[PDB]
Symmetry: C4
Subunit: 371 residues, 4 copies
């Protein structure tokens, strides 16, 4: 079986060189083989660590979305709001003014001026007291405080943001490993009194090693980026989620029950993509660019990942969305758009119900087609 399956799943690229066939969310679809259920009976609650969210959604931690206002509203709307500790929050007193400059640059001088402007704004020094002040606004709302730090600066910044009120620490790059060789993360994560979500991790082995650090969640994928063009690396999200889910299953066995959550970030533009991510093994999803249309989004319709601001090798671009709906409408409807970019909750519940499922974990076994 594994002999013939591996034969089928691999190709000879050339004499003495093989590759593994892998799949994107666009390559697959979910199938109804069961008696249909009612969408009103579908449970979309997300239980992670000590938290229960109404929706299995976290925003991507880019400043294009995540003003303090937005983060609080994400929590009010049933999801997990996530802050970028290392973007514009601690670097510019007037956060709206900084965002406005990126927008102006994009409209006046395309993605080139936008990149240049992002590079300059992110090059300004990080004022930890200003960052802490903004985190306190989120904390004082009563919503759960999740703060993202880069793998590069986690040891320096994590204690500052935890002191400021972070309930959950997100260590997120487009790609992370548990062990890095320079010129450990287990002890560091073990030392914290807050749960940690870490990523991006796209392979089984790296995932398993990351789970062994004590992380409560693993982010699969790299969000929005230009890695395919710049690095020749393109995550096949269906395969990546499924492989990381296999690591989760094996880690559950090895520990006798510790359940590490799989959170998909990448290739997610609509509610169908969310459905497919859950089907592949994800417990939850990061929503990025679809939330840029929200009235509350800091970037007014524009989106960019943090990696768009790298000073030497930017790997992201500013995109613009295609009267703004509220974040509530985007997440809960009523939808006035049939393209799956509003009422994410409704689409998720209807898909599960049509397929005969009433909870997210069970839906990870739904039948799949590859088209």
């Amino acid at each position: 079986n594994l002999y013939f399956q591996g034969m089928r799943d691999h190709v000879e690229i050339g004499i003495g060189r093989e590759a593994r066939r892998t799949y994107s969310l666009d390559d697959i679809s979910v199938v109804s083989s069961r008696r249909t259920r009612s969408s009103k009976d579908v449970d979309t609650t997300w239980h992670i660590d000590a938290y229960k969210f109404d929706l299995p959604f976290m925003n991507h931690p880019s400043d294009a979305l995540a003003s303090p206002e937005f983060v609080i509203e994400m929590g009010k709307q049933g999801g997990l709001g996530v802050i970028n500790a290392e973007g514009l929050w601690g670097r510019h007193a007037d956060l709206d003014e900084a965002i406005a400059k990126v927008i102006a640059a994009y409209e006046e001088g395309d993605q080139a001026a936008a990149t240049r402007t992002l590079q300059e704004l992110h090059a300004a020094p990080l004022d930890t007291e200003l960052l802490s002040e903004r985190i306190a606004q989120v904390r004082d709302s009563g919503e759960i405080v999740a703060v993202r730090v880069s793998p590069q600066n986690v040891r320096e910044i994590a204690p500052i943001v935890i002191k400021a009120g972070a309930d959950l620490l997100v260590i997120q790059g487009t790609l992370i490993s548990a062990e890095h060789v320079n010129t450990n993360l287990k002890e560091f994560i073990g030392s914290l009194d807050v749960p940690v979500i870490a990523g991006g991790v796209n392979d089984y082995t790296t995932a398993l090693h990351m789970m062994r650090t004590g992380a409560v969640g693993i982010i699969v994928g790299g969000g929005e980026n230009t890695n395919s063009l710049a690095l020749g690396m393109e995550v096949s999200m269906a395969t990546a989620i499924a492989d990381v889910a296999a690591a989760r299953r094996d880690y559950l066995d090895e520990t006798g029950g510790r359940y590490v959550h799989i959170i998909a970030d990448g290739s997610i533009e609509n509610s169908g993509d969310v459905v497919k991510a859950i089907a592949c093994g994800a417990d939850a999803v990061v929503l990025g660019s679809p939330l840029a249309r929200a009235e509350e989004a800091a970037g007014k319709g524009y989106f960019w990942p943090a990696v768009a601001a790298h000073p030497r090798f930017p790997r992201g671009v500013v995109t613009e969305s295609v009267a703004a709906p509220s974040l509530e409408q985007i997440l809960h409807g009523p939808s006035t758009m049939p393209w799956g970019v509003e009422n994410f909750e409704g689409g998720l519940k209807r898909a599960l119900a049509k397929c005969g499922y009433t909870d997210l974990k069970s839906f990870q076994k739904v039948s799949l087609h590859v088209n």
Copy 2:
């Protein structure tokens, strides 16, 4: 054989996760391996229950097509006219005025205003006496009266439309199951004195269970909808028709001869798509958007499925067609367009004849290519 075939027809998406390879009508083509026949010798008659139609065609039951005028003309032209009981017919005294508002909204404010306008018009209460009056116009023509009801409201609405003159009841959603769990259909169908066509059903098991309810026909596919984007569900029509045909074959055996018709609705834009649907196992086809060009179509060139009007989660859009031909010309020619959107009869007969077949049932065994 089944071991290696299943190996070939499945893929490993990732570690411990498999998917079935499936196919669309666009993926396939019909092949001539036989002595050619004459198109004048090809029989396209469709014998279902007590009816014999000249053409194996029914219109999709959306108001964009199905005014009383249109429905009658579909019957006059040799097909089966189908009415939407739950659209605009019972909700607005002036049906042309209601249609005009959707058109105006689309031209003035794109698919957003169209969706909003459809949502509002469908939210108006259903007057069963107004609906019955319109059904009576169709009944009084002498054409066969087919009326569609949603799975949701079939128990309430079916008896009203049967009383009004329905000869055939169509229970149609984008996806239906024989058994639904809320918070049976066999007894209900068995209680009626009219034949029932039910769908959409896309899988073998659901089809077999639906056949066991007493339905005389099964609709395969979901018509036009945005399920791929909104739910992550995309019907692979070639595979779906073939799978439902296998259920039909097995149901024929189990009952000793009861023949349930397979009617394809989805992925059908031209006469070649119709040919391919029959080749895969369909006895007949629903024609939707291609008929929107007809002079008699209520929507004047525009099309939309009923699901475009859902108040919380619309899953369809208003499309516009690319001096109107008559429905007669669209169905029987002479065609002045070589793209397969007129003279559907002619294309079907010519395809069968070129492939060496003179009837629709036999054509279900034609050789296929996958390109």
Copy 3:
């Protein structure tokens, strides 16, 4: 071997329904594994029946190309000129005027007016004396006279065109069979004193039966047409040429040496397509739309197949090409365009030479890639 190969070359479309995987010219490419040869050493001569052509090319017999002038020039330039007996030649005294009307209709009213105009012009009665007069112009030039007749009217028209001077009879439809059932061709072909080329034939069995009629050549493919959209039939030319070549090999064995030529018509836009057709087994190729750019082409840059003029079910469209080059330049260069649409001879010879071959028959064994 055949068990596993057939498994690999077939797919399960659905439960109990299979299809054969097939390939287009666009799917393949020719490979150099040998010592390179010089293009000046490559022999492109085409020896068929009693004729030797400098180039293995015949024009597609549509009036958009084939005025008497053009046909003669095709012969002067080293190929085989082919006349449509059943187009405009015998139907309109002023052939340029008729062509001008199609052009005017296309520019003034798109493909709809063009179709309508073609339908009307072809509906005018065929004057056999006018047709014979035009054929005599070609005959009197000293070039080889090839005349195409439809399968439908071959018994009526073939003797007229042979009397008028035809040296070769081409019986061409988009698809032909040796035996047709209505409401034989062997005896008919056997009765003629001229060699016969017949097609289109795309399958092994039909080809073998057509070879047994006495035909000296088989046309594979249907030229330009809308069969994919109108009939759900799309020829996979790489597979079709290869399958018909297998019939040729077997027919050669069965007869002890009778060699039936394979002439590809379909999917041929550039010199690379020609190369690929020969690689798959073709002895020669029909050039259609690429020749419409020739100064001598009757249609002044426009192209259409005869099937664009069918009165009830047209299956072709008028296309327009993208200071006219001469037919000599298109066939022999010098090319000033690097896209393979001029100097067809040069491209063919260079491809063979780069691959290590110096004649067309040997090149049918060249290594292939599927991309």
Copy 4:
């Protein structure tokens, strides 16, 4: 294994005709399965013959890039500058004026006038003293002098360019073989006192024979050309690099250690393509059209291969790029563009580091995905 693998890697095109499945750089991606390294620890040095280049890059030898200024700057920036001996350098006293005419022709009269203008400029006689003068400018800079000659004229031109100062001879056509039959290269290469790089070679056998001539490097691929359209030949670069790498491995064994470099030229538009080429087995890469944006590029944003100028069968086109960056910025950054067309060094190092590698040779074993 080889039985089933070959079955899997081949397809039946038709009865009795097979093809090999092959792959492009676009079909693949590189995978991180290891602990990540730091990009500052990645060694990108290229050791070939007696030379050590900071970057594993050579420019494509077309005049659109390679003025003497540009060639020198390529060397100053850490790569290998390569001169076309047979382009405009020896044919026109005023090289900028000649380039200006191609640009003018392209802007005023599209790719047709550009082709015609290139044909005429290249038809002017080669003045070996003018060529030698320009080569001397490069030589006097102190940078390494690499000069390209065509396979056609290598015996005549190679001694002239070596006398003028060439340190490395590049014998480059879109496709070359070790042995050519007209109407040897080992002795010729063996007679020279300079190392030789030869190509394009895309297959194992031709590569092995070319290695046996004494060449120190093999160019895989044909640069930019229209061979797919004109000849029906399209190089699948992933497969071609891998196959030529297998020849390199076997040649290393047969000789007991002679290492022939693999240099990819074709399908390389961005840093991700470079990464993928190295992963497939390349030691270095030719950069062509991406360098046309450099302020120092002779063609001011325009690019063309030498084969665009062929007098009878041109196989290339003039393309235009989409305030000019310096060549330094294109090769070393800082990048202000996230699409992988600047800071090639940075992208290469970051990709290796993310995948867990610190040198180019080791990276040839990185895991691959086929998407």
